[PDB]
Design an enzyme around this catalytic site. Structure first.
Site, short mmCIF file in Angstrom:
data_model
loop_
_atom_site.label_atom_id
_atom_site.label_comp_id
_atom_site.label_asym_id
_atom_site.label_seq_id
_atom_site.Cartn_x
_atom_site.Cartn_y
_atom_site.Cartn_z
N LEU A 1 0.80 -1.24 0.00
CA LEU A 1 0.00 0.00 0.00
C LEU A 1 0.84 1.29 0.00
O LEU A 1 0.33 2.37 -0.34
CB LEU A 1 -0.96 0.00 1.21
CG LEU A 1 -1.61 -1.35 1.56
CD1 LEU A 1 -2.48 -1.19 2.82
CD2 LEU A 1 -2.43 -1.88 0.37
N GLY A 2 2.11 1.19 0.38
CA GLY A 2 2.96 2.37 0.40
C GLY A 2 4.41 2.00 0.53
O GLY A 2 4.74 0.97 1.12
N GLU A 3 5.30 2.83 0.01
CA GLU A 3 6.73 2.52 0.10
C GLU A 3 7.61 3.74 0.09
O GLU A 3 7.86 4.33 -0.95
CB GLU A 3 7.13 1.58 -1.05
CG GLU A 3 8.65 1.31 -1.17
CD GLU A 3 8.98 0.36 -2.30
OE1 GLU A 3 8.47 0.59 -3.43
OE2 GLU A 3 9.75 -0.60 -2.09
N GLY A 4 8.10 4.13 1.25
CA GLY A 4 8.96 5.29 1.32
C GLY A 4 10.32 4.97 1.88
O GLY A 4 10.67 3.80 2.09
N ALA A 5 11.10 6.01 2.14
CA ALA A 5 12.43 5.81 2.69
C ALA A 5 12.30 5.51 4.18
O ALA A 5 13.24 5.03 4.80
CB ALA A 5 13.28 7.06 2.46
N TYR A 6 11.14 5.80 4.77
CA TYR A 6 10.95 5.55 6.19
C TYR A 6 10.08 4.32 6.40
O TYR A 6 10.49 3.36 7.05
CB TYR A 6 10.31 6.77 6.86
CG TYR A 6 9.88 6.53 8.29
CD1 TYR A 6 10.83 6.43 9.32
CD2 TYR A 6 8.52 6.42 8.62
CE1 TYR A 6 10.43 6.23 10.65
CE2 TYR A 6 8.11 6.23 9.93
CZ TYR A 6 9.07 6.14 10.94
OH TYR A 6 8.67 5.97 12.25
N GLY A 7 8.87 4.33 5.83
CA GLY A 7 8.02 3.18 6.02
C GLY A 7 7.52 2.46 4.77
O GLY A 7 7.49 3.00 3.67
N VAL B 1 4.19 -0.09 3.87
CA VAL B 1 2.92 -0.55 4.42
C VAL B 1 2.27 -1.60 3.51
O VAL B 1 2.18 -1.42 2.32
CB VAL B 1 1.87 0.64 4.61
CG1 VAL B 1 0.59 0.11 5.25
CG2 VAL B 1 2.46 1.76 5.45
N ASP C 1 2.95 17.20 10.08
CA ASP C 1 3.07 16.64 8.71
C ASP C 1 1.68 16.24 8.21
O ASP C 1 1.46 15.14 7.72
CB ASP C 1 4.03 15.43 8.71
CG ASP C 1 4.47 14.99 7.29
OD1 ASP C 1 4.64 15.86 6.40
OD2 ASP C 1 4.66 13.77 7.06
N1 LIG Z 1 -3.74 1.55 8.22
C1 LIG Z 1 -3.61 1.74 6.96
N2 LIG Z 1 -4.55 1.24 6.08
C2 LIG Z 1 -4.48 1.39 4.71
N3 LIG Z 1 -3.49 2.04 4.12
C3 LIG Z 1 -2.56 2.55 4.96
C4 LIG Z 1 -2.55 2.45 6.34
N4 LIG Z 1 -1.49 3.06 6.88
C5 LIG Z 1 -0.84 3.53 5.82
N5 LIG Z 1 -1.44 3.25 4.64
C6 LIG Z 1 -0.97 3.63 3.28
O1 LIG Z 1 0.46 3.82 3.31
C7 LIG Z 1 0.86 5.17 2.98
C8 LIG Z 1 2.10 5.55 3.81
O2 LIG Z 1 1.88 5.38 5.24
P1 LIG Z 1 2.45 6.38 6.29
O3 LIG Z 1 2.00 5.81 7.58
O4 LIG Z 1 2.10 7.80 6.08
O5 LIG Z 1 3.99 6.16 6.27
P2 LIG Z 1 5.13 7.03 5.62
O6 LIG Z 1 5.86 7.57 6.82
O7 LIG Z 1 5.90 6.13 4.76
O8 LIG Z 1 4.47 8.21 4.86
C9 LIG Z 1 -0.40 6.00 3.24
O9 LIG Z 1 -0.32 7.20 2.48
C10 LIG Z 1 -1.52 5.00 2.87
O10 LIG Z 1 -1.84 4.96 1.48
MG LIG Z 2 3.00 9.41 5.36
#
Ligand SMILES: Nc1ncnc2c1ncn2[C@@H]1O[C@H](COP(=O)(O)OP(=O)(O)O)[C@@H](O)[C@H]1O
Ligand SMILES: [Mg+2]
Length: 332
Positions: free
Chosen positions: A19-25, A27, A137
């Site tokens: 669902l997401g892929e950054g330099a920190y997290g 998901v 943020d």
């Molecule tokens: N509980 C969740 N359910 C569904 N999607 C999520 C959830 N948490 C994060 N995501 C997806 O992952 C992305 C990045 O998560 P985020 O917690 O903001 O971490 P980062 O620090 O990498 O930005 C979000 O923009 C969203 O699309």
């Molecule tokens: Mg984020």
């Protein structure tokens, strides 16, 4: 599920999607075999820089301490098998359908939905501010959304306890900005603006460009009185070297937009932080009367600065220091 995504988690879980892929997290959704429930797992590798570890510590302490309808719910945190092996943090939380950035860029939203989203975002900001926490943020991608439109704020690593440049308050860009509740209100206004405009309102390429786009819309602070809120006299010089733009006419810019919405928006995007509407007042603004209920908007309970006592450490904490702190937060 890119093969290059490995989660050292309980076998009880089966990774489903990225669902997401950054330099920190990173998901991913994942099925919990024993219950069949689908969840989301945020994987963090925080031990290469103190910055990432501090962010990790702040984020889990916040997620474990706050309980609110508009704050993402944490289910648990993976328990490391040994201290030596502990190299990743796996936060298991409620699965949400999408996030506001995705909705805004893929959906036409009615006014009612815009009102409800900004409303829930402000309701979360209110409890955080009331607990003396500023998020710092807030942006659409950190606002999670599910099918019935419930919104929950996530990504608490950059928070701070009081005393992307596209959503950052100007004061933060002109000086060693003091952390204030007003900077979160500014981000909230950028988000409301984006909901109306259906794309970011101040997409600056750099710091100069960003301020350019900002004054373009809110008006250039001209008179001294306006610039008196800017600390760095040089910063004041910089501002004066700018064109003297007049506050844009938003009713004409957003002719199809609810006037009350426009009004709320201008009370949020004010140059002077002290003149910016607070979260609480914004919930009381006419634009949101359909959702406002002063008896269902948690005011928050003060958290002492010592909750993040490590943010004040003199001799910067070592990575091993931070690793023990994160470990103890996990096992408690
Ligand atoms: N509980 C969740 N359910 C569904 N999607 C999520 C959830 N948490 C994060 N995501 C997806 O992952 C992305 C990045 O998560 P985020 O917690 O903001 O971490 P980062 O620090 O990498 O930005 C979000 O923009 C969203 O699309
Ligand atoms: Mg984020």
């Amino acid at each position: 599920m890119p093969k290059r995504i490995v989660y050292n988690i309980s076998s009880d879980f089966q990774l489903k999607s990225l669902l997401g892929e950054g330099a920190y997290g990173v998901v991913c959704s994942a099925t919990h075999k024993p219950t069949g429930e689908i969840v989301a797992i945020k994987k963090i590798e925080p031990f290469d820089k103190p910055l990432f570890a501090l962010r990790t510590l702040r984020e889990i302490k916040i997620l474990k301490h706050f309980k609110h309808e508009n704050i993402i719910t944490i289910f648990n945190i993976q328990r490391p098998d040994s201290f030596e092996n502990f190299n990743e943090v796996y936060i298991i939380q409620e699965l949400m359908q999408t996030d506001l950035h995705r909705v805004i860029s893929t959906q036409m939203l009615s006014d009612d939905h815009i009102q409800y989203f900004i409303y829930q975002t402000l309701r979360a900001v209110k409890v955080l501010h009331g607990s003396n926490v500023i998020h710092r943020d807030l942006k659409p991608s950190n606002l999670l959304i599910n099918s019935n439109c419930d919104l929950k704020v996530c990504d608490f690593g950059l928070a701070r306890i009081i005393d992307t440049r596209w959503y950052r308050a100007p004061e933060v860009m002109l000086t060693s900005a003091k952390y204030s509740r007003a900077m979160d209100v500014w981000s909230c206004g950028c988000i409301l603006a984006e909901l109306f405009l259906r794309r970011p309102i101040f997409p600056g390429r750099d710091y100069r460009h960003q301020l350019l786009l900002i004054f373009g819309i809110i008006g250039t602070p001209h008179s001294d009185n306006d610039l008196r809120c800017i600390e760095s006299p040089r910063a004041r010089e910089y501002i004066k070297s700018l064109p003297m733009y007049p506050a844009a006419p938003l009713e004409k810019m957003f002719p199809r937009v609810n006037p009350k919405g426009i009004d709320l928006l201008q009370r949020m995007l004010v140059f002077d932080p002290a003149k910016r509407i607070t979260a609480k007042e914004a919930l009381e603004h006419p634009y949101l009367q359909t959702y406002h209920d002063p008896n269902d908007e948690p005011e928050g309970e003060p958290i002492p600065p010592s909750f993040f006592e490590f943010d004040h450490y003199k001799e910067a904490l070592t990575t091993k220091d931070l690793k023990k702190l994160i470990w103890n937060e996990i096992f408690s």
